[PDB]
Design a protein around this nucleic acid. Sequence first.
DNA 1: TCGCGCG
DNA 2: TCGCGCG
Lengths: 57, 57
Amino acid sequence: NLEQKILQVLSDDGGPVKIGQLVKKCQVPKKTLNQVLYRLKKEDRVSSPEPATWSIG
Amino acid sequence: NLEQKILQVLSDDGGPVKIGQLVKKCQVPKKTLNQVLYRLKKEDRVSSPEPATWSIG
DNA sequence: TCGCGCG
DNA sequence: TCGCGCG
């Protein structure tokens, strides 16, 4: 599950994480990450305080 | 040459052509068309009078 | 009314 | 300072 891996990465970091940093950590392409990230965001489960930058909540 | 085919399609039509209509006519994906279209546009060789709509000049 | 071409 | 997720 990509979703759990993304959440773990973000939670462990604790701060704003760049999409590029998630690629290294999750080992999947940016497009694939963004499909999940934007979904999570619409679910109020992550936020994007900056463009292509992600954090928990 | 995709470039010549795009130009032919646009010239024959004579008016504003939707990206979707170019796919049918050129038989290549939208992304591939747009890479060429935007290049042609930067070359002042096509115009986009509307979003995802293209014409000659 | 989503425009997306992007390196 | 390009944001891109897009169906």
